[PDB]
């Protein structure tokens with residue numbers, strides 16, 4: 273298995289690493305139908321989503337999507353610095369595939 | 376996908392944005408049959424609900440309804456300021472579609 | 479839907495509101511067979527349970543019973559003040575239907 | 582239903598209350614197959630388990646076993662003092678049936 | 685049942701104890717398909733994973749894998765010191781079987 277977020281991210285096409293090195297500025301959560309998602313922003317203005325679960329996801333990703341949203345909320349609330357995001361860049365806002373944090 | 380709670384809110388009929396800019400003043404949770412819901416209030420006097428799951432909701436909203444209640448509870452306990460609420464105004468009290476928090 | 483805990487409580491038979499205006503004094507949780515329940519007490523001497531799930535509950539209450547136990551635990555741990563409890567008075571100890579918190 | 586951990590523990594024939602009055606010293610968690618369990622210790626040296634699920638349990642205990650492990654972790658992390666443990670003392674380590682905490 | 689992580693770790697082939705005695709340096713979480721996993725690192729240079737669920741896991745391990753990831757997140761966020769890890773050494777990076785914390 274990969275040993276770093278960059279190694280993992282490189283296994284996928286249409287992805288890139290953002291080096292965030294910052295805490296989340298805003299957290300947005302929606303339960304509206306067909307928009308069941310989370311959006312985060314940083315003081316850089318950069319904005320990222322956890323996508324609504326769809327047919328682009330395999331069954332094993334369903335729990336992992338829910339976990340990713342749990343992680344972003346608690347990351348927001350604790351003011352924890354995010355190090356990198358691995359994101360798909362074929363989505364607007366770019367879509368999170370993985371996150372890393374260091375202290 | 377939308378980039379902000381206002382953009383997302385505007386995709387739905389019968390909604391409006393409340394700019395709260397404040398922590399939750401009271402949190403109410405019911406496990407009484409047919410009233411399995413959460414109600415929050417603010418110092419300003421406003422009251423909002425997370426509706427009981429019902430036939431107006433689509434399957435994808437089930438998990439998101441539960442997440443929203445989770446979010447409201449930890450937001451309350453941590454005295455986290457809510458920025459905006461996207462609510463449906465055809466319900467009494469108005470019904471939460473989305474929330475945002477800024478730091 | 480109701481706007482307050484008292485409104486909600488009054489929709490049900492065999493209920494009453496206790497005004498607690500205090501943090502939980504003690505929290506007890508059991509995984510013992512037939513006694514899978516939570517008990518809370520207050521310095522006033524007042525004791526309440528979340529009932530063991532049973533045939534008196536409907537399916538929409540299953541998640542909500544688990545949520546209520548979750549809420550009592552974290553409310554205890556954080557020394558959060560409880561405003562009111564809606565309880566069923568045809569159980570001993572009285573059984574929690576709904577809870578509100580407010581400082 | 583019981584109103585205290587003592588009353589509850591008295592309904593079982595191989596149980597014992599351990600008066601702990603202390604925070605958890607160590608927390609151990611395993612996901613190893615057939616050893617999916619939690620072990621806690623205290624400075625007194627006293628060691629306790631949440632048993633692996635099996636035929637010593639009835640179905641109603643399954644969610645409660647997961648809850649109890651959730652409780653021990655957050656109790657450990659928050660340095661929360663445990664008052665009492667009701668345990669089955671026919672197991673090594675003694676097996677947790679219920680927990681109480683007071684402040 | 686085992687009374688310590690050391691005893692437990694000894695019941696498995698291809699495992700060893702790592703004495704960590706430190707907080708986690710970095711946390712990585714992926715929801716990318718076929719890489720739904722968590723990676724942790726320490727200042728010692730060691731890297732460990734919670735494996736992607738797979739045919740090597742038995743049904744009783746599926747909730748325990750999710751729990752372990754939950755534990756690693758909150759341990760990271762709270763700067764909690766890890767005592768030992770029981771890991772499988774037939775995986776790269778080595779795969780977490782059990783964790784102990786004291787502190």
Ligand SMILES: O=C(O)c1cccc(O[C@H]2O[C@H](CO)[C@H](O)[C@H](O)[C@H]2O)c1
Pocket residue numbers: 304305306387389426431432433436463465466470
């Ligand atoms: O999500 C939509 O596309 C939608 C379409 C038509 C009505 C609508 O709102 C109703 O359902 C929501 C919950 O999804 C809420 O209860 C509103 O009060 C309803 O009007 C949403």
Ligand SMILES: O=C(O)c1cccc(O[C@H]2O[C@H](CO)[C@H](O)[C@H](O)[C@H]2O)c1
Pocket residue numbers: 407408409490492529534535536539566568569573
């Ligand atoms: O929720 C109702 O409309 C209802 C109907 C009949 C009985 C009832 O209360 C009983 O169940 C609650 C749990 O939902 C509690 O155990 C009471 O003690 C029971 O009487 C509610």
Ligand SMILES: O=C(O)c1cccc(O[C@H]2O[C@H](CO)[C@H](O)[C@H](O)[C@H]2O)c1
Pocket residue numbers: 510511592593594595596632637638639642669670671672676
């Ligand atoms: O003594 C009793 O009344 C009693 C009832 C049900 C189970 C029980 O203990 C056994 O099961 C628990 C877990 O439910 C635990 O493993 C004990 O070690 C078992 O003896 C006692």
Ligand SMILES: OC[C@H]1O[C@H](O)[C@H](O)[C@@H](O)[C@H]1O
Pocket residue numbers: 286323328329330333360362363367716717
């Ligand atoms: O697994 C989710 C992933 O699925 C595909 O790879 C898409 O191209 C991405 O944009 C993303 O949605």
Ligand SMILES: OC[C@H]1O[C@H](O)[C@H](O)[C@@H](O)[C@H]1O
Pocket residue numbers: 613614698735740741742745772774775779
């Ligand atoms: O239970 C998980 C465990 O399963 C097997 O025994 C493998 O050999 C280990 O590498 C580990 O993956």
